[PDB]
């Protein structure tokens, strides 16, 4: 879950 | 029931990624960032589909980070609830992986929320290392955990 | 020659106001930078007057707008 | 001009996959674009007001305010300072109480006084936060989106306002000392306000205290902390009074900062429940008496024991930050007394005790082995309070800074090595600079390995050369370091006592805990990377990737790991039995060896939580229990954070  | 896994190959198969992303992904992700991923690196791409319709579907991406090694990327992962436990997520990953490998990857990183415990056992199966911990990193709250799987 | 005409208006239209104006009214103005075949704008350092906000970059979808406007 | 018409006809007619951008905009500046459409992605979006337009309407009240309607504004306003000083934005979370945007508008005194004290608060905690910079970039969000927090009344002016108001309250709690039950309830809200008014006021001097510049008014704190739990005992008694919130309340605006959102993605602080308002503010006032303590250490060893002490408990921003400025209240004088290059020369006499820094010897008054032994020093100065500030961040955090530090640490090992030389060749002592720079780099590593059993970054099949490292090798060292340094003592002559019977403790768990994990693998009951290709040659070296940096003690490559710890040198080759008797030994040794210690401090009552049931396991483990089955074993890490409980 790509994250900031 | 046979599970058929297919490349990415045009732009119509977009609607059936982010539908199956946002219905199980948490983050919120813009179609532009869809774009980005499957423009750029096409062949990392790779969907499951049995039928006529989309049950999986995993994006990816590679790049050299600090010019120092060669950094692949796992972006999305998605599996529909119904077809989940099939090993269709397993599979997905190991193709991207190949290919990861077959375009000379160093290493292969990602990160997912701590309480998601399916995907950490998936990826402790498939070998992944826990490399650090992130307090707070996402918008829902929960901490994330950075996977690697070391190559070289 | 249609759409190569088509292209070269829209890749003029670039670098100046266009304003969104959404279903929401929200009048954001900003400045047009990309477009896409589902009619959706992305814009640059582009302000929102509810009814000045400074946005980094809009991304005014295509089924939320309903008319822009370029002065 | 309208062009949408001829706009959407152009857009509906192009490739299908096509973008219009130029020559300098691909697909990364159009990453992170607000889509203003989704809820999660867009962050703005009865009526919204502020304090000027909410005056003259008069859904606001500021005369003649109530007693329930007071408690419940001032409950819910430290609900939001504790939201905020938990890592929550500061506009969304404590300036939605519409009288802190502007106090002066304010006419009752108790209200006024208590907005400036919360506002007095807030801007003494921004202050030593940002001052000790020891904040992550997501773990406080000290930006004030342009506002003005008390800067035109004293402090001094503050708190004399709010010994005003409570006194002008107790003259009416005295007054209804005593059937009436309305004249009950009454005194019941009135000695609730009085109480919340009085631990303001004793939040608020002990910054101020912590704010001065000098040591003693630190101290001068303790007697007002200690006063904080009969205040906070009061006001989580008398919690049932106050107005209710609607969620909302009577005088607060949730929404009235729009204009002031971020630009990116929101988060959406949620502020705490009034239940839970009274067990943090309990927990920070503890929190802050067992910093108040540090001004009385006098030793770099004890003051950076202290650090790892306080830091293990996973203390909250504000309260690190206190801690390291009340150590640092300058950029170079420590306690604002000593200067630290004489606590260094201190810490160094009392560890290693080198001729130069003796007295008696002829090189404290040599002109040039004193200037290369103040060179040392003054080089030495500044990894100590880099280490310091490592220690002052988070748990998370820690890890990779740690690892960074270790080259640092090495250059400093590297020029003492070179500086004792020398120093030994003039003389003529041997590694004793040398010596304690090995204990504290040893000290280093040990701790940056065991972080990782702490933020559980260890998976099952990499305990068993994770404890290996620490046991054989590092453990081992530093009992070497640490008898070499006792010895040379007492050669020029017990403090470090203590320090060993606990080095030897942990060793010998560790120890143990390897041989059960090797022997755990051996009959089968760890389950292993099954599917693609990890060589566990890789993964050991990108483990231990950090040490290489470090020359004294040796990096362990895995060649050489495989030969050290192979069970094939043992002729013959010992059974799982021989593996678990080994670690039942071991784990008994560590027992015996904590229960001869003299006053077991809490670190050893929580190791003795996991010693003695760890060792029934395995004995009881060793006589063939459940041999048979290859489920593995669950690891509790709740007794203690590095060394679990073998659970079958
Ligand atoms: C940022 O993208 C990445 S986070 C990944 C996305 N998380 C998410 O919630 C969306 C997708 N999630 C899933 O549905 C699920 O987590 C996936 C993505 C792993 C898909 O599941 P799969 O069914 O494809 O997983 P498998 O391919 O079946 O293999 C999973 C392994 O882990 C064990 N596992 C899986 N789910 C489990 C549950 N619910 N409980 C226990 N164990 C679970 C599987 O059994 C398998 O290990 P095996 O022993 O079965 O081989």
Same mark, same amino acid.
């Given at each position: 879950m790509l994250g900031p | 029931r046979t599970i058929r896994y297919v490349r990415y190959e045009s732009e119509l198969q977009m609607p059936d990624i982010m539908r199956l992303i946002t219905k199980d992904l948490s983050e919120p992700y813009s179609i532009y960032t869809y774009r980005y991923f499957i423009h750029n690196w096409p062949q990392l791409c790779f969907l499951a589909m049995v039928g006529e319709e989309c049950v999986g579907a995993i994006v990816c991406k590679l790049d050299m980070h600090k010019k120092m090694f060669r950094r692949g990327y796992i972006a999305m992962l998605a599996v529909d609830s119904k077809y989940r436990r099939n090993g269709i997520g397993t599979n997905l990953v190991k193709k991207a992986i190949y290919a990861m490998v077959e375009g000379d990857c160093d290493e292969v990183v990602l990160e997912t929320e701590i309480t998601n415990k399916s995907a950490l056992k998936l990826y402790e199966n498939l070998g992944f290392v826990r490399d650090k911990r992130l307090f707070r990193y996402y918008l829902n709250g929960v901490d994330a955990l950075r996977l690697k799987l070391w190559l070289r | 020659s249609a759409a190569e005409r088509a292209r070269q208006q829209l890749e003029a239209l670039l670098n100046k106001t266009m304003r969104i104006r959404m279903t929401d009214g929200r009048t954001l103005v900003g400045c047009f930078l990309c477009t896409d075949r589902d009619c959706n704008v992305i814009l640059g350092s582009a302000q929102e007057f509810l009814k000045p906000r400074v946005l980094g970059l809009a991304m005014v979808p295509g089924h939320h707008i309903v008319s822009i406007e370029v002065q | 001009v309208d062009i949408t018409q001829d706009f959407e006809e152009a857009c509906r007619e192009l490739k299908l996959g096509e973008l219009l951008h130029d020559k300098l905009f691909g697909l990364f500046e159009a990453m992170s674009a607000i889509e203003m459409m989704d809820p999660k992605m867009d $962050? +703005?979006? !009865?009526?919204?007001?502020n304090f000027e337009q909410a005056i003259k309407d008069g859904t606001i009240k500021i005369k003649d305010l109530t007693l329930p309607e007071l408690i419940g504004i001032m409950d819910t306003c430290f609900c939001c300072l504790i939201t905020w000083l938990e890592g929550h934005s500061l506009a969304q979370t404590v300036f939605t109480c519409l009288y802190i945007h502007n106090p002066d508008f304010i006419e009752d005194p108790a209200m006024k006084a208590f907005a400036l004290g919360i506002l007095k608060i807030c801007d003494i905690a921004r202050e030593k936060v940002n001052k000790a910079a020891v904040f992550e970039? #997501?773990?406080f969000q000290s930006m004030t989106y342009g506002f003005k927090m008390a800067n035109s009344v004293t402090? =001094?002016? @503050?708190?004399g306002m709010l010994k005003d108001v409570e006194?002008? /309250?107790?003259?009416? @709690?005295?007054?209804? !000392?005593?059937?009436?039950?309305? @004249?009950?309830l009454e005194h019941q809200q009135c000695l609730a306000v009085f109480s919340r008014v009085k631990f303001t006021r004793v939040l608020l001097t002990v910054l101020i205290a912590f704010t001065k510049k000098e040591t003693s008014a630190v101290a001068e704190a303790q007697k007002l902390m200690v006063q904080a739990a009969d205040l906070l005992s009061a006001i989580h008694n008398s919690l049932h009074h106050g107005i209710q919130a609607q969620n909302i /309340? /009577? +005088?607060?605006?949730? =929404? @009235?900062?729009?204009? *002031?959102?971020?630009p990116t993605f929101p988060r959406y602080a949620k502020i705490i429940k009034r239940e839970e308002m009274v067990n943090y503010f309990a927990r920070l006032i503890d929190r802050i008496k067992t910093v108040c303590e540090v001004v009385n250490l006098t030793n770099l060893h004890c003051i950076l024991d202290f650090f790892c002490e306080f830091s293990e408990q996973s203390p909250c921003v504000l309260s !690190?930050? =206190? =801690?390291?400025?009340?150590?640092?209240?300058?950029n170079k004088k420590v306690f604002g007394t000593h200067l630290m290059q004489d606590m260094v020369k201190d810490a160094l006499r009392s560890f290693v005790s080198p001729p130069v820094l003796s007295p008696k010897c002829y090189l404290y008054n040599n002109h040039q082995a004193k200037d290369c032994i103040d060179s040392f020093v003054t080089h030495c100065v500044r990894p100590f309070c880099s280490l310091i500030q490592i220690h002052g961040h988070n748990r998370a955090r820690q890890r990779d800074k740690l690892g960074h530090i270790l080259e640092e640490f090495a250059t400093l090992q590297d020029e003492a090595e070179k500086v004792d030389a020398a120093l030994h060749t003039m003389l003529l002592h041997l590694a004793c600079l040398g010596t304690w720079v090995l204990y504290h780099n040893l000290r280093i590593m040990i701790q940056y390995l065991l972080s990782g059993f702490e933020l559980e970054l260890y998976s099952m099949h990499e305990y068993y050369y994770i404890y290996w490292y620490l046991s054989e090798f590092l453990y081992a060292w530093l009992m070497s370091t640490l008898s070499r340094a006792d010895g040379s003592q007492m $050669? #020029?002559?017990?403090? *470090?006592?203590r320090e060993i019977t606990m080095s030897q403790a942990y060793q010998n768990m560790c120890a143990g805990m390897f041989k059960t994990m090797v022997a755990f693998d051996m009959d089968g009951k760890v389950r292993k990377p099954k599917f693609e290709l990890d060589s566990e040659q890789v993964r050991y070296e990108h483990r231990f990737a950090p040490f290489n940096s470090v020359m004294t003690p040796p990096p362990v490559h895995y060649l050489q790991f495989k030969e050290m710890s192979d069970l094939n040198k043992y002729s013959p080759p010992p059974q799982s039995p021989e593996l678990y008797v080994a670690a039942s030994k071991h784990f008994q040794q560590a027992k015996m060896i904590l229960e001869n210690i003299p006053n077991p401090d809490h670190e050893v009552n929580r190791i003795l939580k996991v010693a003695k049931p760890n060792f029934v396991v395995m004995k009881l483990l060793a006589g063939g229990h459940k041999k048979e089955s290859k489920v593995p074993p669950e690891f509790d890490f709740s007794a203690h954070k590095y060394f679990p409980v073998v659970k079958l």
């Amino acid at each position: 879950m790509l994250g900031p | 029931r046979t599970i058929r896994y297919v490349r990415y190959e045009s732009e119509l198969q977009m609607p059936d990624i982010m539908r199956l992303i946002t219905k199980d992904l948490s983050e919120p992700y813009s179609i532009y960032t869809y774009r980005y991923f499957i423009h750029n690196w096409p062949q990392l791409c790779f969907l499951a589909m049995v039928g006529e319709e989309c049950v999986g579907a995993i994006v990816c991406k590679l790049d050299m980070h600090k010019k120092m090694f060669r950094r692949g990327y796992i972006a999305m992962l998605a599996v529909d609830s119904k077809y989940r436990r099939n090993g269709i997520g397993t599979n997905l990953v190991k193709k991207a992986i190949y290919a990861m490998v077959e375009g000379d990857c160093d290493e292969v990183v990602l990160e997912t929320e701590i309480t998601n415990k399916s995907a950490l056992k998936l990826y402790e199966n498939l070998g992944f290392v826990r490399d650090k911990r992130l307090f707070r990193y996402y918008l829902n709250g929960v901490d994330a955990l950075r996977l690697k799987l070391w190559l070289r | 020659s249609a759409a190569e005409r088509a292209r070269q208006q829209l890749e003029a239209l670039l670098n100046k106001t266009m304003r969104i104006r959404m279903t929401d009214g929200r009048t954001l103005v900003g400045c047009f930078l990309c477009t896409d075949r589902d009619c959706n704008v992305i814009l640059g350092s582009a302000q929102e007057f509810l009814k000045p906000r400074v946005l980094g970059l809009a991304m005014v979808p295509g089924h939320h707008i309903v008319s822009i406007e370029v002065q | 001009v309208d062009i949408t018409q001829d706009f959407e006809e152009a857009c509906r007619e192009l490739k299908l996959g096509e973008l219009l951008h130029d020559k300098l905009f691909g697909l990364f500046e159009a990453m992170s674009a607000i889509e203003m459409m989704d809820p999660k992605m867009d $962050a +703005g979006m !009865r009526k919204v007001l502020n304090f000027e337009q909410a005056i003259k309407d008069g859904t606001i009240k500021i005369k003649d305010l109530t007693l329930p309607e007071l408690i419940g504004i001032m409950d819910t306003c430290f609900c939001c300072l504790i939201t905020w000083l938990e890592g929550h934005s500061l506009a969304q979370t404590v300036f939605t109480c519409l009288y802190i945007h502007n106090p002066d508008f304010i006419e009752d005194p108790a209200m006024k006084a208590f907005a400036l004290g919360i506002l007095k608060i807030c801007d003494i905690a921004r202050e030593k936060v940002n001052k000790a910079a020891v904040f992550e970039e #997501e773990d406080f969000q000290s930006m004030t989106y342009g506002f003005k927090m008390a800067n035109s009344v004293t402090d =001094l002016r @503050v708190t004399g306002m709010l010994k005003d108001v409570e006194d002008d /309250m107790q003259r009416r @709690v005295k007054s209804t !000392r005593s059937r009436d039950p309305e @004249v009950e309830l009454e005194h019941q809200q009135c000695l609730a306000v009085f109480s919340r008014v009085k631990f303001t006021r004793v939040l608020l001097t002990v910054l101020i205290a912590f704010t001065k510049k000098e040591t003693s008014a630190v101290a001068e704190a303790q007697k007002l902390m200690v006063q904080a739990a009969d205040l906070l005992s009061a006001i989580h008694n008398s919690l049932h009074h106050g107005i209710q919130a609607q969620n909302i /309340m /009577m +005088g607060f605006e949730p =929404l @009235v900062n729009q204009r *002031l959102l971020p630009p990116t993605f929101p988060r959406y602080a949620k502020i705490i429940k009034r239940e839970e308002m009274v067990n943090y503010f309990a927990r920070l006032i503890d929190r802050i008496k067992t910093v108040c303590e540090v001004v009385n250490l006098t030793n770099l060893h004890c003051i950076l024991d202290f650090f790892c002490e306080f830091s293990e408990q996973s203390p909250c921003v504000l309260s !690190r930050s =206190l =801690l390291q400025t009340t150590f640092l209240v300058d950029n170079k004088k420590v306690f604002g007394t000593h200067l630290m290059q004489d606590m260094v020369k201190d810490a160094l006499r009392s560890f290693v005790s080198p001729p130069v820094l003796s007295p008696k010897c002829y090189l404290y008054n040599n002109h040039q082995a004193k200037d290369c032994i103040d060179s040392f020093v003054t080089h030495c100065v500044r990894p100590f309070c880099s280490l310091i500030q490592i220690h002052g961040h988070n748990r998370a955090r820690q890890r990779d800074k740690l690892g960074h530090i270790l080259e640092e640490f090495a250059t400093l090992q590297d020029e003492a090595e070179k500086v004792d030389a020398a120093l030994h060749t003039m003389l003529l002592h041997l590694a004793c600079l040398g010596t304690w720079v090995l204990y504290h780099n040893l000290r280093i590593m040990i701790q940056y390995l065991l972080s990782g059993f702490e933020l559980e970054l260890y998976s099952m099949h990499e305990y068993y050369y994770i404890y290996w490292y620490l046991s054989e090798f590092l453990y081992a060292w530093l009992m070497s370091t640490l008898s070499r340094a006792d010895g040379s003592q007492m $050669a #020029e002559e017990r403090p *470090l006592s203590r320090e060993i019977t606990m080095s030897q403790a942990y060793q010998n768990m560790c120890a143990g805990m390897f041989k059960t994990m090797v022997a755990f693998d051996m009959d089968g009951k760890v389950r292993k990377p099954k599917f693609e290709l990890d060589s566990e040659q890789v993964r050991y070296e990108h483990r231990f990737a950090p040490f290489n940096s470090v020359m004294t003690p040796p990096p362990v490559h895995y060649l050489q790991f495989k030969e050290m710890s192979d069970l094939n040198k043992y002729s013959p080759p010992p059974q799982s039995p021989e593996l678990y008797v080994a670690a039942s030994k071991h784990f008994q040794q560590a027992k015996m060896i904590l229960e001869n210690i003299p006053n077991p401090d809490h670190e050893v009552n929580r190791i003795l939580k996991v010693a003695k049931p760890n060792f029934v396991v395995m004995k009881l483990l060793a006589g063939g229990h459940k041999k048979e089955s290859k489920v593995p074993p669950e690891f509790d890490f709740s007794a203690h954070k590095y060394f679990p409980v073998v659970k079958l």
